[PDB]
Amino acid sequence: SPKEILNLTSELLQKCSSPAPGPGKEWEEYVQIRTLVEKIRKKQKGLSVTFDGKREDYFPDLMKWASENGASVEGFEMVNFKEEGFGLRATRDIKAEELFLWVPRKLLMTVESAKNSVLGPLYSQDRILQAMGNIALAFHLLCERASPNSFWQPYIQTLPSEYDTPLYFEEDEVRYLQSTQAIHDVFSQYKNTARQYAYFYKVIQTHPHANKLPLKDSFTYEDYRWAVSSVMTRQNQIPTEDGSRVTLALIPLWDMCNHTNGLITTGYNLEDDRCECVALQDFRAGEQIYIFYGTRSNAEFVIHSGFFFDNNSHDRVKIKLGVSKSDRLYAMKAEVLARAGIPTSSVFALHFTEPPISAQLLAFLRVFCMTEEELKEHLLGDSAIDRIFTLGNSEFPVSWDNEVKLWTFLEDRASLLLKTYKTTIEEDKSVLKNHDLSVRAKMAIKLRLGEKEILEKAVKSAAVNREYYRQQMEEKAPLPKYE
Amino acid sequence: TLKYPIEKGIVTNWDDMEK
Ligand SMILES: Nc1ncnc2c1ncn2[C@@H]1O[C@H](CSCC[C@H](N)C(=O)O)[C@@H](O)[C@H]1O
């Protein structure tokens, strides 16, 4: 058996270290990796360390441990909500902007605490650990989990045992994402995690600095999937105690708040050396306490956080664009972009708003559609820098013609992207209405529906903008000038 | 505002072969 696992992890390492097989082979590669991971997983015992009690049996220990080390533990309780899982619920009225939660640095698990732990010796030898604090945090979490006397046991025993990151999806649940933008990130995440598991399985076997690790005696795929899912769904960037550098950290107690829309209200207080959270809104006694995780897209919430957020006001899709080297004005356009601080080719975002495009994407599209005479006015003379300064401002176009061309282009391109999906928006809504689906399956379908609804909105917005600027052109309206 | 705003679950790079 142990030699069999070594052989299997050896094959898995070579499979997941091979170069990308080509985008049209990525689904086939994905299933091939899945088959190998599941073969290993079925030969292992799940999580190496499990706990006797229910998850909620350990929340009092979490509170008592947080209390002894200076954290806030009054005014909220732990409740298992159907929609979000476990969260915090107010036990008293909490006013907006009230400082209601604080967590001193001693309670955090950080890259720095990883370096000073039993993982320290291996951390100083392995180049992946030194370069990637998120993987370092994951192994820190696993080593302390398997250490019964770890300082952080009261926190670890309250963590989830399973997540809804795509690593946990069934094959047919990921299959819903075929032909989307998001599925490539699902593929990468799965291949990344399998490669890392196999790589570190063998590193732990061969390095003497790993001899004192609990992972030397038991390190399963389920261990690693759990550890990386814990870190990707919960990790945070905080300053170092020095204040001059940033590090990654798990923040007990506060990380039990679930997400709602709003603004970030959690910050780090270096003077008191603690995490501090003020209330995002009034919370009456008996209401769930929410925070705003950040301006992430639903693709990021699904892949990295394991949930889909309905009415995510910050949703977006990618659109890759670049000036073609066969364009005869390539040199001029590249130089205008360079003076504006924009690459010649890049990945931009389309947002679910109006306009759908950022200042940087507007500026790129203006240059992308410029005539030679317009390019020359952005390259020469005493007004050239003034012209570049306004390139990302919707109120000061280059010319009416430039606007009509760029919104025509964006309308055409967004329409073309819609045609590359296997299903239509109307088909996706029918699936969600007429089938009975798992949470994970719904996350997948809503994600692919979301991508198309953003593109459809961009098509409508670009068509509306095209009509607007075509009217200004036909009416010979004076172009606005920044003065 | 907050000198050190904390984004819960900030996205990190996991591609060890890229970086
Ligand atoms: N608005 C929301 N809807 C659904 N699940 C949510 C959510 N906000 C947060 N979550 C869940 O909470 C996780 C972040 S940690 C928050 C505490 C967590 N529910 C727990 O039981 O430990 C996410 O990975 C997701 O599973």
Author numbering:
A (entry chain A): 20 to 502
B (entry chain Y): 66 to 84
Q: What does the article say, verbatim?
A:
Here we elucidate the structural and molecular determinant(s) of target specificity of histidine vs. lysine in the active site of SETD3. On the substrate-binding surface, the residues are diverse, reflecting the fact that the three enzymes act on three very distinct substrates—the large subunit of Rubisco by LSMT, RelA subunit of nuclear factor NFκB by SETD6, and actin by SETD3—with limited sequence similarity immediately surrounding the methylation target. To facilitate the methyl transfer reaction, SETD3 provides a local environment that promotes deprotonation of the target nitrogen N3 of histidine (and concomitant protonation of N1). Most (if not all) SAM-dependent MTases use the classic SN2 reaction mechanism, which requires the target nitrogen be in a deprotonated state.
